[PDB]
Symmetry: C3
Subunit: 115 residues, 3 copies
Protein backbone atom coordinates (compact mmCIF):
# COMPACT_ATOMS: atom_id res chain seq x y z
CA UNK A 1 0.00 0.00 0.00
CA UNK A 2 2.33 2.74 -1.25
CA UNK A 3 1.31 6.31 -2.12
CA UNK A 4 -1.90 6.17 -0.11
CA UNK A 5 -4.65 8.76 -0.53
CA UNK A 6 -7.59 9.02 1.89
CA UNK A 7 -10.57 11.02 0.59
CA UNK A 8 -13.15 11.92 3.26
CA UNK A 9 -16.63 13.44 3.04
CA UNK A 10 -18.84 14.20 6.06
CA UNK A 11 -21.99 16.16 6.80
CA UNK A 12 -20.48 17.35 10.09
CA UNK A 13 -19.28 20.95 9.99
CA UNK A 14 -15.71 21.51 11.17
CA UNK A 15 -13.81 24.71 11.79
CA UNK A 16 -10.71 25.29 9.64
CA UNK A 17 -8.53 24.42 12.61
CA UNK A 18 -10.48 21.23 13.30
CA UNK A 19 -9.94 20.16 9.68
CA UNK A 20 -6.21 20.95 9.82
CA UNK A 21 -5.87 18.74 12.92
CA UNK A 22 -8.06 16.03 11.39
CA UNK A 23 -5.99 15.71 8.21
CA UNK A 24 -2.82 15.46 10.28
CA UNK A 25 -4.24 12.84 12.66
CA UNK A 26 -5.98 10.78 9.99
CA UNK A 27 -2.88 10.91 7.80
CA UNK A 28 -0.73 9.72 10.71
CA UNK A 29 -3.18 6.86 11.24
CA UNK A 30 -2.87 5.87 7.59
CA UNK A 31 0.94 6.04 7.83
CA UNK A 32 0.95 3.82 10.92
CA UNK A 33 -1.48 1.12 9.80
CA UNK A 34 -0.15 0.82 6.23
CA UNK A 35 3.48 1.02 7.42
CA UNK A 36 4.24 3.79 4.89
CA UNK A 37 6.13 7.06 5.54
CA UNK A 38 4.01 10.18 6.01
CA UNK A 39 5.82 11.92 3.12
CA UNK A 40 3.66 9.97 0.58
CA UNK A 41 0.33 10.16 2.42
CA UNK A 42 -2.42 12.34 0.92
CA UNK A 43 -5.57 13.28 2.88
CA UNK A 44 -8.55 15.30 1.62
CA UNK A 45 -11.42 16.26 3.91
CA UNK A 46 -14.68 17.82 2.74
CA UNK A 47 -17.16 18.80 5.46
CA UNK A 48 -20.64 20.23 5.25
CA UNK A 49 -21.50 17.68 2.55
CA UNK A 50 -25.11 16.52 2.33
CA UNK A 51 -25.00 12.87 3.38
CA UNK A 52 -27.71 10.27 3.79
CA UNK A 53 -26.72 6.81 5.00
CA UNK A 54 -29.23 4.10 5.76
CA UNK A 55 -31.93 6.68 5.03
CA UNK A 56 -30.77 8.96 7.87
CA UNK A 57 -28.98 12.29 7.56
CA UNK A 58 -27.53 12.06 11.08
CA UNK A 59 -23.77 12.55 11.36
CA UNK A 60 -21.95 10.20 8.99
CA UNK A 61 -18.72 9.96 7.05
CA UNK A 62 -17.75 8.49 3.69
CA UNK A 63 -14.08 7.58 3.06
CA UNK A 64 -12.16 6.03 0.19
CA UNK A 65 -8.64 4.74 0.88
CA UNK A 66 -6.59 4.39 -2.33
CA UNK A 67 -3.07 3.02 -2.63
CA UNK A 68 -0.62 1.29 -4.94
CA UNK A 69 -1.40 -2.40 -4.41
CA UNK A 70 -4.90 -7.30 2.10
CA UNK A 71 -7.56 -8.84 4.36
CA UNK A 72 -5.57 -8.21 7.54
CA UNK A 73 -4.35 -4.69 6.78
CA UNK A 74 -7.83 -3.63 5.63
CA UNK A 75 -9.31 -4.68 8.99
CA UNK A 76 -6.71 -2.76 11.01
CA UNK A 77 -7.10 0.30 8.76
CA UNK A 78 -10.91 0.22 9.03
CA UNK A 79 -10.75 -0.01 12.82
CA UNK A 80 -8.21 2.76 13.30
CA UNK A 81 -9.86 5.18 10.90
CA UNK A 82 -13.30 4.41 12.38
CA UNK A 83 -11.90 5.02 15.86
CA UNK A 84 -10.85 8.56 14.94
CA UNK A 85 -14.49 9.33 14.11
CA UNK A 86 -15.99 7.52 17.10
CA UNK A 87 -13.54 9.39 19.32
CA UNK A 88 -15.13 12.57 17.87
CA UNK A 89 -18.73 11.56 18.53
CA UNK A 90 -19.74 9.70 15.37
CA UNK A 91 -21.55 6.39 15.60
CA UNK A 92 -19.24 3.71 14.23
CA UNK A 93 -21.90 2.16 12.02
CA UNK A 94 -22.26 5.52 10.21
CA UNK A 95 -18.62 5.43 9.05
CA UNK A 96 -18.47 3.99 5.49
CA UNK A 97 -14.95 3.04 4.33
CA UNK A 98 -14.17 1.75 0.82
CA UNK A 99 -10.76 0.51 -0.36
CA UNK A 100 -9.53 1.15 -3.93
CA UNK A 101 -6.11 -0.38 -4.66
CA UNK A 102 -4.36 0.52 -7.91
CA UNK A 103 -1.49 -0.70 -10.05
CA UNK A 104 1.69 1.37 -10.26
CA UNK A 105 0.88 2.30 -13.87
CA UNK A 106 -2.44 3.81 -12.68
CA UNK A 107 -0.85 6.27 -10.23
CA UNK A 108 0.54 9.62 -11.36
CA UNK A 109 3.00 11.53 -9.22
CA UNK A 110 5.63 14.20 -9.94
CA UNK A 111 4.45 14.15 -13.56
CA UNK A 112 5.11 10.44 -14.17
CA UNK A 113 3.94 6.98 -13.11
CA UNK A 114 5.80 4.21 -11.27
CA UNK A 115 5.56 1.70 -14.13
Amino acid sequence: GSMPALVIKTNAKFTEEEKSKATEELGNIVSKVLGKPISYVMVTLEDGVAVRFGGSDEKAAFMSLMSIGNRAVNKRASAALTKWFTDHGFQGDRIYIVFNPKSAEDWGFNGDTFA
Copy 2:
Protein backbone atom coordinates in the same frame (compact mmCIF):
# COMPACT_ATOMS: atom_id res chain seq x y z
CA UNK B 1 -17.04 6.75 -23.88
CA UNK B 2 -16.53 10.10 -22.23
CA UNK B 3 -13.79 10.65 -19.63
CA UNK B 4 -14.26 12.38 -16.29
CA UNK B 5 -11.60 14.38 -14.41
CA UNK B 6 -12.39 15.11 -10.72
CA UNK B 7 -10.09 17.75 -9.17
CA UNK B 8 -9.70 18.69 -5.47
CA UNK B 9 -7.28 21.30 -4.15
CA UNK B 10 -6.72 23.35 -1.02
CA UNK B 11 -5.90 26.32 -3.24
CA UNK B 12 -8.65 28.92 -3.44
CA UNK B 13 -9.57 30.01 -7.00
CA UNK B 14 -11.58 32.95 -8.29
CA UNK B 15 -14.55 32.21 -10.57
CA UNK B 16 -12.49 33.13 -13.63
CA UNK B 17 -9.62 30.92 -12.46
CA UNK B 18 -12.07 28.02 -12.06
CA UNK B 19 -13.61 28.64 -15.48
CA UNK B 20 -10.20 28.69 -17.15
CA UNK B 21 -9.00 25.62 -15.24
CA UNK B 22 -11.91 23.38 -16.19
CA UNK B 23 -11.58 24.47 -19.85
CA UNK B 24 -7.82 24.02 -20.04
CA UNK B 25 -7.58 20.79 -18.03
CA UNK B 26 -10.56 19.36 -19.93
CA UNK B 27 -8.83 20.17 -23.22
CA UNK B 28 -5.63 18.51 -21.95
CA UNK B 29 -7.61 15.33 -21.20
CA UNK B 30 -9.34 15.37 -24.60
CA UNK B 31 -6.05 15.80 -26.42
CA UNK B 32 -4.07 13.20 -24.49
CA UNK B 33 -6.86 10.59 -24.63
CA UNK B 34 -7.64 11.14 -28.34
CA UNK B 35 -11.17 12.36 -27.61
CA UNK B 36 -13.01 15.31 -29.21
CA UNK B 37 -12.41 18.73 -27.75
CA UNK B 38 -15.02 19.38 -25.05
CA UNK B 39 -15.95 15.65 -24.82
CA UNK B 40 -15.14 15.42 -21.16
CA UNK B 41 -16.68 15.93 -17.73
CA UNK B 42 -14.55 18.01 -15.37
CA UNK B 43 -15.30 18.86 -11.74
CA UNK B 44 -13.17 21.20 -9.62
CA UNK B 45 -13.52 21.67 -5.86
CA UNK B 46 -11.24 24.27 -4.31
CA UNK B 47 -10.78 25.32 -0.71
CA UNK B 48 -10.76 21.67 0.32
CA UNK B 49 -8.78 20.69 3.41
CA UNK B 50 -5.77 18.83 2.02
CA UNK B 51 -2.64 17.45 3.62
CA UNK B 52 0.14 15.80 1.62
CA UNK B 53 3.45 14.62 3.02
CA UNK B 54 2.24 15.96 6.37
CA UNK B 55 2.12 19.50 4.96
CA UNK B 56 -0.91 21.66 4.21
CA UNK B 57 0.95 23.52 1.48
CA UNK B 58 -0.90 23.87 -1.80
CA UNK B 59 -1.61 20.48 -3.34
CA UNK B 60 -4.04 18.82 -5.77
CA UNK B 61 -5.71 15.41 -6.02
CA UNK B 62 -7.16 14.27 -9.37
CA UNK B 63 -9.10 11.18 -10.41
CA UNK B 64 -9.21 10.52 -14.20
CA UNK B 65 -11.92 7.97 -15.15
CA UNK B 66 -11.92 6.63 -18.72
CA UNK B 67 -13.60 3.49 -20.05
CA UNK B 68 -6.13 4.44 -20.60
CA UNK B 69 -2.94 2.35 -20.59
CA UNK B 70 0.57 2.56 -19.16
CA UNK B 71 1.80 4.86 -21.96
CA UNK B 72 -1.22 7.18 -22.07
CA UNK B 73 -1.21 7.47 -18.27
CA UNK B 74 2.33 8.80 -18.32
CA UNK B 75 1.51 11.38 -20.99
CA UNK B 76 -1.64 12.38 -19.07
CA UNK B 77 0.25 12.68 -15.78
CA UNK B 78 2.88 14.91 -17.40
CA UNK B 79 0.39 17.14 -19.24
CA UNK B 80 -1.97 17.62 -16.29
CA UNK B 81 0.93 18.16 -13.88
CA UNK B 82 2.43 20.76 -16.25
CA UNK B 83 -0.81 22.75 -16.04
CA UNK B 84 -0.46 22.86 -12.26
CA UNK B 85 3.25 23.64 -12.18
CA UNK B 86 2.61 26.45 -14.69
CA UNK B 87 0.05 27.83 -12.21
CA UNK B 88 2.33 27.84 -9.18
CA UNK B 89 1.90 24.34 -7.72
CA UNK B 90 4.81 22.11 -6.75
CA UNK B 91 5.09 19.23 -9.19
CA UNK B 92 5.60 16.71 -6.34
CA UNK B 93 2.35 17.80 -4.60
CA UNK B 94 0.11 16.62 -7.49
CA UNK B 95 -1.45 13.16 -7.09
CA UNK B 96 -3.32 11.69 -10.08
CA UNK B 97 -5.19 8.37 -9.80
CA UNK B 98 -6.29 6.64 -13.01
CA UNK B 99 -9.46 4.51 -13.18
Copy 3:
Protein backbone atom coordinates in the same frame (compact mmCIF):
# COMPACT_ATOMS: atom_id res chain seq x y z
CA SER C 1 -22.37 -4.82 -0.74
CA MET C 2 -23.15 -1.32 0.57
CA PRO C 3 -23.67 0.91 -2.50
CA ALA C 4 -22.61 4.53 -2.57
CA LEU C 5 -23.91 7.28 -4.85
CA VAL C 6 -21.65 10.35 -5.01
CA ILE C 7 -23.24 13.38 -6.65
CA LYS C 8 -21.64 16.67 -7.69
CA THR C 9 -23.51 19.59 -9.29
CA ASN C 10 -22.86 23.23 -10.13
CA ALA C 11 -26.45 24.01 -9.15
CA LYS C 12 -26.90 25.58 -5.71
CA PHE C 13 -29.38 23.83 -3.40
CA THR C 14 -30.81 24.86 -0.08
CA GLU C 15 -30.46 22.49 2.85
CA GLU C 16 -34.06 21.40 2.35
CA GLU C 17 -33.50 20.78 -1.35
CA LYS C 18 -30.42 18.67 -0.53
CA SER C 19 -32.29 16.68 2.12
CA LYS C 20 -35.06 15.78 -0.33
CA ALA C 21 -32.56 14.90 -3.05
CA THR C 22 -30.50 12.48 -0.95
CA GLU C 23 -33.71 10.79 0.20
CA GLU C 24 -35.25 10.37 -3.25
CA LEU C 25 -31.99 9.46 -5.01
CA GLY C 26 -31.07 6.99 -2.26
CA ASN C 27 -34.49 5.38 -2.62
CA ILE C 28 -33.81 5.00 -6.36
CA VAL C 29 -30.48 3.30 -5.66
CA SER C 30 -32.17 0.92 -3.20
CA LYS C 31 -34.73 -0.04 -5.81
CA VAL C 32 -32.53 -0.44 -8.86
CA LEU C 33 -29.74 -2.27 -7.03
CA GLY C 34 -32.16 -4.35 -4.97
CA LYS C 35 -30.53 -3.39 -1.67
CA PRO C 36 -32.27 -2.36 1.60
CA ILE C 37 -31.97 1.38 2.27
CA SER C 38 -30.01 0.56 5.44
CA TYR C 39 -27.05 -0.32 3.15
CA VAL C 40 -27.22 2.76 0.88
CA MET C 41 -24.92 5.79 1.14
CA VAL C 42 -25.62 9.05 -0.74
CA THR C 43 -23.38 12.13 -0.77
CA LEU C 44 -24.31 15.38 -2.53
CA GLU C 45 -22.04 18.36 -3.20
CA ASP C 46 -23.48 21.51 -4.79
CA GLY C 47 -21.79 24.70 -5.93
CA VAL C 48 -19.04 22.63 -7.63
CA ALA C 49 -17.24 24.09 -10.65
CA VAL C 50 -18.32 21.85 -13.50
CA ARG C 51 -17.62 21.80 -17.23
CA PHE C 52 -19.37 19.18 -19.38
CA GLY C 53 -19.31 19.22 -23.16
CA GLY C 54 -17.23 22.38 -22.93
CA SER C 55 -20.05 24.21 -21.14
CA ASP C 56 -20.45 25.30 -17.53
CA GLU C 57 -24.24 25.25 -17.84
CA LYS C 58 -26.17 23.48 -15.07
CA ALA C 59 -25.02 19.87 -14.95
CA ALA C 60 -24.67 16.91 -12.57
CA PHE C 61 -21.98 14.22 -12.18
CA MET C 62 -22.75 10.93 -10.38
CA SER C 63 -20.59 7.96 -9.45
CA LEU C 64 -22.41 4.83 -8.34
CA MET C 65 -20.16 2.47 -6.39
CA SER C 66 -21.50 -1.08 -6.02
CA ILE C 67 -19.89 -4.52 -6.37
CA GLY C 68 -21.05 -5.20 -9.93
CA ASN C 69 -23.92 -5.78 -15.16
CA ARG C 70 -25.17 -4.00 -18.27
CA ALA C 71 -28.84 -4.60 -17.45
CA VAL C 72 -28.86 -3.16 -13.93
CA ASN C 73 -26.57 -0.31 -15.04
CA LYS C 74 -29.00 0.64 -17.81
CA ARG C 75 -31.96 0.75 -15.40
CA ALA C 76 -29.91 2.67 -12.84
CA SER C 77 -28.85 5.28 -15.37
CA ALA C 78 -32.41 5.71 -16.60
CA ALA C 79 -33.98 6.01 -13.14
CA LEU C 80 -31.34 8.41 -11.78
CA THR C 81 -31.46 10.57 -14.91
CA LYS C 82 -35.26 10.81 -14.68
CA TRP C 83 -34.95 12.25 -11.18
CA PHE C 84 -32.68 15.02 -12.48
CA THR C 85 -34.80 15.72 -15.58
CA ASP C 86 -37.92 15.81 -13.39
CA HIS C 87 -36.14 18.37 -11.15
CA GLY C 88 -35.06 20.88 -13.80
CA PHE C 89 -31.89 19.42 -15.33
CA GLN C 90 -31.41 18.80 -19.04
CA GLY C 91 -31.00 15.11 -19.74
CA ASP C 92 -27.85 15.47 -21.83
CA ARG C 93 -26.12 17.24 -18.91
CA ILE C 94 -26.34 14.24 -16.56
CA TYR C 95 -23.19 12.10 -16.46
CA ILE C 96 -23.18 8.82 -14.53
CA VAL C 97 -20.19 6.52 -14.10
CA PHE C 98 -20.33 3.05 -12.55
CA ASN C 99 -17.45 1.71 -10.43
CA PRO C 100 -17.85 -2.02 -9.63
